[PDB]
Amino acid sequence: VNSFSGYLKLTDNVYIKNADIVEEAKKVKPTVVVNAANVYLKHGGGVAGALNKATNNAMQVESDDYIATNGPLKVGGSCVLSGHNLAKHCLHVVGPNVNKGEDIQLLKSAYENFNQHEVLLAPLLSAGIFGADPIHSLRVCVDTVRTNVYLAVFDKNLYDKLVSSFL
Numbered sequence: 637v638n639s640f641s642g643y644l645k646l647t648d649n650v651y652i653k654n655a656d657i658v659e660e661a662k663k664v665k666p667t668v669v670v671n672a673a674n675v676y677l678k679h680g681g682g683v684a685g686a687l688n689k690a691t692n693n694a695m696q697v698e699s700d701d702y703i704a705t706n707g708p709l710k711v712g713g714s715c716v717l718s719g720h721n722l723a724k725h726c727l728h729v730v731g732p733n734v735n736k737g738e739d740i741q742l743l744k745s746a747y748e749n750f751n752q753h754e755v756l757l758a759p760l761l762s763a764g765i766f767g768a769d770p771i772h773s774l775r776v777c778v779d780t781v782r783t784n785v786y787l788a789v790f791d792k793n794l795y796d797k798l799v800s801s802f803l
């Protein structure tokens with residue numbers, strides 16, 4: 637038993653809810669919140685801008701030190717940093733950005749990072765301003781992630797379409 641409430645069960649291990657990933661993290665304080673990162677960990681908009689704003693920019697300060705030391709992530713890759721006031725840890729995962737021409741086949745590699753963590757609160761990778769089809773992103777999630785993932789879909793209209801079209 638865990639602290640997640642109000643989720644619809646899609647599979648043995650995947651759950652979904654219409655919720656803002658920021659408000660959900662603040663309420664649950666999960667072990668792991670996933671950020672929809674880019675390779676530079678420049679948290680400007682969407683999940684990353686919203687998560688970073690909720691940390692009063694501490695996520696960005698930590699991220700800049702990480703990049704100064706390690707260089708950029710790979711598309712499909714991840715790093716574990718602090719969760720600040722939102723979670724124990726933040727798993728920053730880079731899905732391909734369709735609006736930059738990145739290979740959508742890298743979405744499966746991106747979701748494979750989630751398997752290193754027993755439970756996660758996450759957004760749909762490569763959705764929203766990353767330009768991928770969210771229905772596709774949910775299918776890859778279900779077919780790739782084997783650990784317990786609690787998906788927060790911000791858009792109510794999209795949430796209803798994801799549920800009603802789910803195979």
Ligand SMILES: CC(=O)Nc1ccc(C(=O)O)cc1
Pocket residue numbers: 656657658682683686759760763764765788789790
């Ligand atoms: C404030 C705010 O922008 N929140 C969010 C939450 C989730 C997403 C997303 O999943 O794309 C985008 C934006």
